[PDB]
Structures are given as C-alpha cells and as structure tokens.
Amino acid sequence: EVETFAFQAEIAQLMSLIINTFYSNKEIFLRELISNSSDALDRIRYESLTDPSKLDSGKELHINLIPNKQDRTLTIVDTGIGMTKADLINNLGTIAKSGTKAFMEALQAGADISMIGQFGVGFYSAYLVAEKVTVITKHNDDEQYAWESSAGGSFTVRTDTGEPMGRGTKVILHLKEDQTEYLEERRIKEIVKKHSQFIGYPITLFVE
Numbered sequence: 664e665v666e667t668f669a670f671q672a673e674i675a676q677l678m679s680l681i682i683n684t685f686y687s688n689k690e691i692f693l694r695e696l697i698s699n700s701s702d703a704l705d706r707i708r709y710e711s712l713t714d715p716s717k718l719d720s721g722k723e724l725h726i727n728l729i730p731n732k733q734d735r736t737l738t739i740v741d742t743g744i745g746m747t748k749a750d751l752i753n754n755l756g757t758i759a760k761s762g763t764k765a766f767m768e769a770l771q772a773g774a775d776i777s778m779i780g781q782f783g784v785g786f787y788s789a790y791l792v793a794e795k796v797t798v799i800t801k802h803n804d805d806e807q808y809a810w811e812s813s814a815g816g817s818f819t820v821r822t823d824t825g826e827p828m829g830r831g832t833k834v835i836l837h838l839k840e841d842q843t844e845y846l847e848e849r850r851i852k853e854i855v856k857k858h859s860q861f862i863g864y865p866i867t868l869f870v871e
C-alpha cells in the first residue's frame with residue numbers, strides 16, 4: 664500500500680529551484696549526503712552511550728557509496744540512526760520550512776547553492792543530479808520504509824519489503840541521463856577527497 668503526500672509549498676519551491684537554476688557545481692550533492700550520513704552516525708553513537716542496546720540492530724558505523732551503471736543509480740548507505748515514518752511524512756517537512764526560507768532568502772542576497780547545508784536542507788541538493796530519489800530507512804523505533812520523489816510536488820511512502828537493513832538509511836539517486844559521471848570511480852574518489860576527507864567514519868567506495 665503506497666501513500667502519496669504533497670510537499671509543503673516551500674519545499675516544492677526549493678526543489679523546483681534546485682532543478683531549474685543553472686548551476687554547474689553539481690558535485691556538492693555528494694558532500695551534503697555524506698555529511699547527513701555522518702550526522703546520523705553521530706546521533707546513534709551518542710544515543711548508544713546512554714542505551715547500549717540501541718546498537719543491537721548493528722554495531723558497525725560506516726558509509727558505503729555504491730554506483731550501479733546498469734540501473735544508473737548512485738546509492739549512499741549509512742548505518743546511522745535512521746528515520747521514522749513520522750519523520751518522513753511530517754517532521755522533516757515541518758522543521759525544514761524555516762531553513763528553506765532562510766536559504767532562498769540568502770540566495771536572493773547573493774549566496775550560492777553550495778551553502779545549502781548551512782540551512783539544514785542539503786538533502787535536496789540530490790536533485791542537482793537525480794531525476795528521482797528513493798530513500799530506504801530503518802530506525803530502531805519503527806519499521807523499514809521507502810520514501811520516493813521525482814519532485815513535481817509529491818512524494819510517496821510505503822513499507823519496504825526489500826532486503827532488511829537492520830538500521831540506517833540508503834539514499835538511492837536515480838541519475839539524470841547527463842549526470843552519469845557520478846558513477847565513475849575516479850570521479851567519486853575525486854569528490855570525496857575534495858569535500859569529505861575528514862569525515863570520522865569509514866567511507867567505502869564500491870566498484871563495479
């Protein structure tokens with residue numbers, strides 16, 4: 664059973680801006696998603712200090728980058744804290760409205776799209792390179808869900824029947840036809856070295 668939701672108008676506007684603005688420095692999407700993974704790994708690690716059973720769903724704290732040229736997908740996998748259904752349907756859009764407003768204001772004031780992460784909404788930079796984004800996520804307090812959006816003002820949420828993850832988040836980028844450079848080992852290595860060299864978790868770039 665698939666549920667379809669409308670984005671808040673401000674988030675739909677942000678997604679249209681990211682899709683429509685001419686901006687060549689698209690590679691920053693990967694820094695933003697890796698940063699989000701690192702933050703989610705920090706969260707589960709710190710929570711585990713007070714409740715060690717929170718790692719019963721998996722002790723390993725890592726980030727995997729998985730290109731697939733057959734499917735034309737780049738997947739950013741982490742074993743961080745994950746997201747609840749309530750996050751996916753309500754909490755994320757509610758909290759992000761203020762960051763989105765501040766970001767779009769900053770852009771009019773001359774700021775650059777690369778500053779998007781300072782406003783808490785760097786996830787949406789995925790749409791610089793992806794025509795569709797699928798997020799598979801598992802939080803200790805909830806079931807495994809699949810969120811998906813091709814923009815256009817709506818997203819879907821369903822329970823995920825795929826391979827159980829234990830805990831964490833997979834961001835699956837269905838790349839635009841002209842953005843397949845982000846499936847190349849040499850290109851991903853270059854971007855991780857440039858923007859993500861000090862992330863405090865192992866980043867494994869899978870190869871094909």
Ligand SMILES: Nc1ncnc2c1nc(Sc1cc3c(cc1I)OCO3)n2C[C@@H]1CCCN(Cc2cccc(S(=O)(=O)F)c2)C1
Pocket residue numbers: 699700702703741743744745746751755758759760761762763782783784785786798810831832
């Ligand atoms: N790998 C990851 N693992 C776990 N959780 C993650 C995450 N990746 C993201 S980002 C993501 C993923 C989405 C999505 C929207 C967004 I955004 O829809 C579909 O998938 N999250 C959510 C973040 C976590 C940090 C808090 N944050 C909300 C917030 C709190 C306080 C202030 C502000 S704010 O005032 O600064 F706007 C924002 C949402």
Ligand SMILES: [K+]
Pocket residue numbers: 729730731736737738
């Ligand atoms: K992939």
Ligand code: NA
Pocket residue numbers: none
């Ligand atoms: Na900060």
